[PDB]
């Protein structure tokens, strides 16, 4: 009358695991031919009394996702026209179309020589560039010689104007044998034993918005402003702040752009900026002044909760370096905007119908990722572009020291790309299902 | 009386299904070095009293054939020398030979600047081209400026002289879990029940013959001419006529053409017609006149059953469009022919040896599959060639609309590559095997 | 009494079968991301009472290794800068820096018109070339009109200096359902039964060493020198000789080269030898003389067991062809050496410190294998190259017959890659596991 081994199959047991995930949908760079529609009825367990500890920054789903994004960008860019043939000496002069003082030096007009439909023939041609797309190549020879910024490094590629960069949300789905755990704790600290967990087969959709200093168009915190950091005393690491109210931002490139097209080679079309008509004004973004101040007050109080009381907090501008890190960056319509944050991070805090305008600059030749293996040229956009978006979170860093609970200074970060999604995927964990278990009893 | 449920596994149950098929091998475009070995002994199994209803035009096997053929052309074409380096201004003069009346203006002697093995040495070269391959740039001035017709669109690419275009038949095979149903009925016109069926694992081989107006080298009807269409009253549809008697056609290019070649670059070579030995004459095809007349009369005999009686039936030439929809196009020896069919579709039939010679045109720069993303240069063929082939069927277009609903007139059509394959795929359907089923009984 | 058919599953039965193998490592050419982590436990299991016949030269593990090296080289070279913009003529003269009469005219001082980052600018540049890399034009006015030797074939490609070509060993692993059976018999040559065997899931690592005459860094024979051949009576097959005495060989390129680089196109970097600091010296390899004599004497003792006794044996050098089949071709440090081994094969054997110095040639443009549809360049190496390797075996051929079938003579040659790897893979056989079988017994 001893005990014996009994085998049970179909046991509800989890193991931490890393596997691949499927792409699921609700031309376009992400919503591609090899991504499938989801089933819109998640089979949740409605929070049974299961407690599970998990965290951010160690969730390798992020890394897989990051790699997929890079792959999608390259796949859509491979069958596109090389702009290599355009790496020629350029001749720039001053642009003369009623440019205001604030815009002097922003645009340059170059003439150049280029190939065309027939190999032995070359046609003089001209185009308009933003100053940031070119460099001066020789004061000694004269004062008009320029080249495109990336002609001395990997080739610049552009075509496929028909492909959308609209951030269509993508869902991730588990393979059979796997499941995704989901945290419903709206007070979750980013690392702890989430008491409110469920299971899904697919995550909700996440918009692949790529940005630097401010996170746009993400999930909104539902109850309160929250803060996430791997280590609060680590001043090398970034701090993620999720807002519980959106900040509405109105951006524009208020200039009417004519788009021109020429052929470089055999069906090798090139699109470029033609005349800009009307006068020339600076690109910019507006935020409600009142809402921004309200937003910061909430952020400051939340920061204080992780510091002592009456901590004096300051906001300030970035350290410089590449424009990508220096400024806020986003894409809209295929256009690339680099915006100053001087009107956003300036004020200080104490223990006790207007707007903010941020000037913006435009770039066309961009090293999209942190690697310099390739380069992409943005197509021009015909007409006038206006964009409206929601700030859902901030990326801040602490200065490398503060003194005696004062002048605690935060500045825009955005140095990593991965936190653009860590901020969305923090609610999920991936586990393997291990249906085979053993538990003893008394039987024949 | 109280009966229970049993489960049967290995149940003979069918479901319609959409899956893919394999390949058949026993180089060229289709029966490639990466093609599945064929089945030396497929087993056809007659099914006692199975009647199966199926439809042509709902048969996805056609679409699979289409996509595979396109893929195979691209795989074959990809590792070829591009002819972009030859997209130069051509200085054109006449042909110093005995030119017949119908060949004057058909050929031009083009000279040009060409590259050599080293990028500092350039030479003058010349080649003969067909008129359809060459376009006038500036008729005003120069009176000598010409280029290849597709140098202002996607590049013309083609070399790979070692690869044949022989339409080697490919057998399609189903994966395990699937079966192919073959219809043995000899009256059915593709929309309805088939009282005599059998199943196979693999189909017989199907030859991917390129065609337009006339269907060459297809399987022949065994008992009667069958005219098949999606909707008889819909004049926007193509009409497939499958003959029960072959009509022999003999084509020639009676010109002892000599192939010359140049080295363009680093292992980059191009072949073209240089000298022509003997007189220059137009390519042509012969169709037995007597056979055609009787054969067409048989088609008419059947049209009189599909349509009403005492209707005069007429045949006429197509109305227009580019060469690819006005001529009978076919491949022979890797070369592409575009033959006039006016001597064939010219008759009136009422209810109450010799030969047809068809003049042909030659096009070397080809925009195959109506795809505008690429073009190919068929290589020249050394010497005089002959083509012998069988006419198995026709694609007709009924001219819809008539005062008092009389005198039906038909014109050749067939401007869809998918409609050629219908002639062999119409006999097959793909089925998923469903081995599980449930039925009632007396057990407990 | 009567025995019934019975079924046993889990039966230890082998079949001779061919499948592919998994790559496991120990970036590089071979140790790429597409390779499995090192087997932590090469759990070898010796088999009692098992004898199997392992005929090598039937062993298709060789063919799989052959295909893998070719594919890996292509994957590594694929993204590298091409040398097509360098296929121009050059103005060459004799470079001078205290060059002896033996090397006189071997190294050239050449100039050419280079493309710069901007395609519309050209400059004159200098670099050094070895005579074996370049060819002249005789009749076209003057001799200083050199071109690279392979600009008449597939583009010469090479860059990616960061990639290591060090022959890091790779392990092969069986797929599930398969096992690798290893021969433990130290006396085993390549044919017939092996009385002592064991199995593994993974083999030890094998270094992908490329060689034409002297097999370098390989498995050593442990008891005796072993002579292996598919056929030991004809003169059609190569003779594979494994030594049991490693022979140390010291190779050098005694030239303190300086490396210079340019940009030709968009990040399209090119590297070349610039000057040489200090005077120029002849490349060579040093073999201990006594060791070599002992080595050959041991080979002779073994030849006498396949051949008769009291036979005079003579050695001679390769009959000729390109350097790849005439010299000892090997790579070290990325440099390609072509060493004259006649000094190793200029002696006779009879019926009953002091070094050997072998002069070497250096080549930069290579074709890797025996295919001529590809060409590669080689980077210059900065500084002096000193290499130390172990001669593990010889690839020998026998001369095609002799008077009275006496005085046998031998020569190095037959340097096919396939025959090098035979010396490492002869120990292994791959079999399939067939767990199911029938063995009748008494039952109901």
């Amino acid at each position: 009358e001893n005990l014996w081994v009994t085998v049970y199959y179909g046991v509800p047991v989890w193991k931490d695991a890393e596997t691949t995930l499927f792409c699921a949908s609700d031309h376009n760079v992400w919503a591609t031919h090899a991504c499938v529609p989801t089933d819109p009825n998640p089979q949740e367990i409605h929070l049974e009394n299961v407690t599970e500890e998990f965290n951010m920054w160690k969730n390798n789903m992020v890394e897989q996702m990051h790699e997929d994004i890079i792959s999608l960008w390259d796949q859509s860019l491979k069958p596109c026209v090389k702009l290599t043939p355009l790496c020629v000496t350029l001749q720039c002069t001053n642009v003369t179309n009623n440019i205001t003082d604030d815009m002097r030096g922003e645009l340059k007009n170059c003439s150049f020589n280029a190939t065309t439909e027939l190999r032995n023939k070359r046609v003089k041609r001209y185009s308009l560039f933003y100053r940031l797309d070119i460099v001066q190549i020789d004061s000694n020879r004269a004062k008009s010689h320029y080249r495109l910024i990336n002609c001395n490094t990997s080739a610049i590629t552009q075509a496929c104007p028909k492909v959308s960069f609209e951030p269509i949300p993508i869902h991730y789905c588990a393979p059979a044998g796997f499941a995704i755990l989901k945290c419903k704790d709206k007070k979750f600290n980013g690392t702890g034993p989430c008491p409110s967990v469920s299971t899904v087969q697919c995550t909700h959709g996440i918009k692949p918005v790529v940005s630097t200093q401010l996170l746009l168009n993400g999930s909104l915190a539902e109850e309160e402003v929250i803060i996430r950091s791997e280590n609060i005393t680590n001043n090398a690491k970034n701090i993620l702040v999720q807002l519980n109210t959106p900040v509405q931002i109105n951006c524009t490139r208020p200039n009417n752009n004519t788009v021109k097209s020429i052929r470089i080679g055999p069906g090798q079309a090139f699109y470029y900026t033609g005349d800009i008509i009307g006068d020339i004004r600076q690109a910019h973004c507006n935020v409600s002044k009142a809402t921004w101040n309200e937003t910061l007050g909430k952020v400051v109080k939340q920061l204080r909760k992780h510091f002592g009381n009456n901590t004096i907090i300051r906001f300030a501008q970035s350290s410089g370096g590449d424009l990508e890190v220096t400024t806020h960056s986003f894409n809209c319509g295929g256009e690339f905007f680099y915006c100053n944050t001087s009107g956003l991070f300036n004020s200080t805090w104490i223990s006790n119908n207007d707007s903010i305008t941020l000037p913006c600059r435009i770039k066309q030749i961009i090293n999209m990722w942190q690697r310099i293996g390739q380069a992409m040229y943005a197509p021009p956009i015909q007409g006038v572009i206006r964009c409206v978006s929601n700030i859902t979170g901030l990326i801040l860093t602490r200065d490398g020291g503060s003194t005696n609970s004062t002048t605690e200074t935060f500045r825009p970060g955005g140095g990593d790309m991965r936190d653009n999604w860590r901020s969305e995927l923090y609610k999920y964990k991936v586990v393997k299902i291990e249906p085979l278990g053993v538990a003893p009893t008394r039987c024949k | 009386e109280n009966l229970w449920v049993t489960v049967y596994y290995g149940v003979p149950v069918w479901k319609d299904a959409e899956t893919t098929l394999f390949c058949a091998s026993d180089h060229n475009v289709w029966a490639t070095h990466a093609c599945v070995p064929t089945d030396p002994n497929p087993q056809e199994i007659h099914l006692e009293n199975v009647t199966e209803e199926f439809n042509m035009w709902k048969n996805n096997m056609v679409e699979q054939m289409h996509e595979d053929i396109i893929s195979l052309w691209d795989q074959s074409l990809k590792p070829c020398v591009k002819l972009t380096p030859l997209c130069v201004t051509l200085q054109c003069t006449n042909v110093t030979n005995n030119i017949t009346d119908d060949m004057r203006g058909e050929l031009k002697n083009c000279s040009f600047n060409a590259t050599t093995e080293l990028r500092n040495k350039r030479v003058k070269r010349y080649s003969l081209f067909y008129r359809l391959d060459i376009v006038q740039i500036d008729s005003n001035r120069a009176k000598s400026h010409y280029r290849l017709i597709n140098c202002n669109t996607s590049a013309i690419t083609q070399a790979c002289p070692k690869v044949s275009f022989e339409p080697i038949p490919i057998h399609y095979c189903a994966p395990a879990g699937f079966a192919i149903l073959k219809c043995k009925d000899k009256k059915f016109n593709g929309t309805g029940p088939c009282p005599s069926v059998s199943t196979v694992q693999c189909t017989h081989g199907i030859k991917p013959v390129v065609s337009t107006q006339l269907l060459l080298n297809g399987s022949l009807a065994e008992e009667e001419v069958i005219i098949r269409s999606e909707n008889i009253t819909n004049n926007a549809k193509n009409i497939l006529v499958q003959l029960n008697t072959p009509v022999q056609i003999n084509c020639t290019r009676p010109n002892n053409n000599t192939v010359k070649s140049i080295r363009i670059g680093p292992g980059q070579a191009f072949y073209y017609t240089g000298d022509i030995i003997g007189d220059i004459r137009q390519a042509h095809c012969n169709v037995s006149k007597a056979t055609w007349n009787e054969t067409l009369g048989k088609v008419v005999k059947q049209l009189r059953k599909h349509f009403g009686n005492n209707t005069i039936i007429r045949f006429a030439q197509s109305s227009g469009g580019d060469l690819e929809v006005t001529t009978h196009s076919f491949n022979c020896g890797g070369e592409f022919f575009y033959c006039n069919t006016s001597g064939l579709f010219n008759s009136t039939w009422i209810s109450n040896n010799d030969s047809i010679t068809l003049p042909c045109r030659i096009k070397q720069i080809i925009n195959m599959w109506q795809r505008i993303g690429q073009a190919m240069y068929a290589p020249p063929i050394q010497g005089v060639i002959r083509c012998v082939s069988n006419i198995t069927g026709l694609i007709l277009t009924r001219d819809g609309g008539s005062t008092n609903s009389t005198t039906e007139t038909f014109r050749p059509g067939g401007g869809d590559m998918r409609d050629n394959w219908r002639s062999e795929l119409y006999k097959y359907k793909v089925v998923k095997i469903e081995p599980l089923g449930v039925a009632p009984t007396r057990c407990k | 009494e009567n025995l019934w058919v019975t079924v046993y599953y889990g039966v230890p039965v082998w079949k001779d079968a061919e499948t592919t193998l998994f790559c496991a490592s120990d970036h590089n050419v071979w140790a790429t991301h597409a390779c499995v982590p090192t087997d932590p436990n090469p759990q070898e299991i010796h088999l009692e009472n098992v004898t199997e016949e392992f005929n090598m030269w039937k062993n298709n593990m060789v063919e799989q290794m052959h295909e893998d090296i070719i594919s890996l080289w292509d994957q590594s070279l694929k993204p590298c800068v091409k040398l097509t913009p360098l296929c121009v003529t050059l103005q060459c003269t004799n470079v001078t820096n205290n060059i002896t009469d033996d090397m006189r005219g071997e190294l050239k001082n050449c100039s050419f018109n280079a493309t710069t980052e901007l395609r519309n600018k050209r400059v004159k540049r200098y670099s050094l070339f070895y005579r074996l890399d370049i060819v002249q034009i005789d009749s076209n006015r003057a001799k200083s009109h050199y071109r690279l030797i392979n600009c008449n074939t597939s583009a010469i490609t090479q860059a990616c200096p960061k990639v290591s070509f060090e022959p890091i060993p790779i392990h092969y692993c069986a797929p599930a359902g398969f096992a690798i059976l290893k021969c433990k018999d130290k006396k085993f040559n390549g044919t017939g039964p092996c009385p002592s065997v064991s199995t593994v899931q993974c083999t030890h690592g094998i270094k992908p060493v490329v060689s034409t005459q002297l097999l370098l860094n390989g498995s050593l024979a442990e008891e005796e020198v072993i002579i292996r051949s598919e056929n030991i009576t004809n003169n059609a097959k190569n003779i594979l000789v494994q030594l049991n005495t490693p022979v140390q060989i010291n190779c050098t390129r005694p030239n303190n080269n300086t490396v210079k680089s340019i940009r030709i196109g968009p990040g399209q970097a090119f590297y070349y030898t610039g000057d040489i600091i200090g005077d120029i010296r002849q490349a060579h390899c040093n073999v201990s003389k006594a060791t070599w004599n002992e080595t050959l004497g041991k080979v002779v003792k073994q030849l006498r067991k396949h051949f008769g006794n009291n036979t005079i044996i003579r050695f001679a050098q390769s009959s000729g062809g390109d350097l790849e089949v005439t010299t000892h071709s090997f790579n070290c440090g990325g440099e390609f050496f072509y060493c004259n081994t006649s000094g190793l094969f200029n002696s006779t054997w009879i019926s009953n410190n002091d070094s050997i110095t072998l002069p070497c040639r250096i080549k930069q443009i290579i074709n890797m294998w025996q295919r001529i549809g590809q060409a590669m360049y080689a980077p210059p190496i900065q500084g002096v190259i000193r290499c130390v390797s172990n001669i593990t075996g010889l690839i020998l051929t026998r001369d095609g017959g002799s008077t009275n079938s006496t005085t046998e003579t031998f020569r190095p040659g037959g340097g096919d890659m396939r025959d090098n790897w035979r010396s490492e893979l002869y120990k292994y056989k791959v079999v399939k596991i067939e767990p199911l079988g029938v063995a009748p017994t008494r039952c109901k």
Partner: antibody
Amino acid sequence: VQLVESGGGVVQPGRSLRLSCAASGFTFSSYGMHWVRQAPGKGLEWVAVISYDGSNKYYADSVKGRFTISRDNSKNTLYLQMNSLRAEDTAVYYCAREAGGPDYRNGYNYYDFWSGYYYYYYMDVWGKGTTVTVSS
Amino acid sequence: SALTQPASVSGSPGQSITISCTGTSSDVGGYNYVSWYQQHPGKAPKLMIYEVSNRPSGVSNRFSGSKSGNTASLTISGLQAEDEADYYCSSYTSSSTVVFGGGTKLTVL
């Protein structure tokens, strides 16, 4: 390959006159053009030159303020508008083409904007001339 | 304004004669844009030499030319009756205008 002048009428002093060169047989629109005049018994005097877009117009000082050069790329026609004609302006006026073409440099032909030819700096094609007379 | 050129030149048939023309920095000592024309009376002029010594297609090899400093020179070797035409020198100037010389009458006797 012809330049045909017309409009060589007779006017009173101080009156205007329009000449027109009916160019034909060449891509007129791709070539620069000139007007030259020669009074009876006198040598050749240059009057004016015009570019494809007209972006460049130069005149002899002697005709400045009295002569305007213009053109029609499509009608293949060159024009000269004379104003306030002086007795001294009586001359045979000629239409002449500026030579030029592509520039064969560094292996590849180079062309101006809209594929216009560049200038080789010497007149090549000449017309026949027409006579412009100021009466007295 | 005009280039200096002799009113007339002369020589016997079959002889080589040259016609000089003098400009300034803004011609021959400023550009190679220096040309010569032959004008048979009653006709528009035709180009004989351009680019100092260039030969238009159709012009005989007995016609040549040179420059030195600000002086241009047209060479007519082997004078014939067909050469009794006015000769003109001209230049594309700095100022992008065309300057002509006075015109030389050649008599062959």
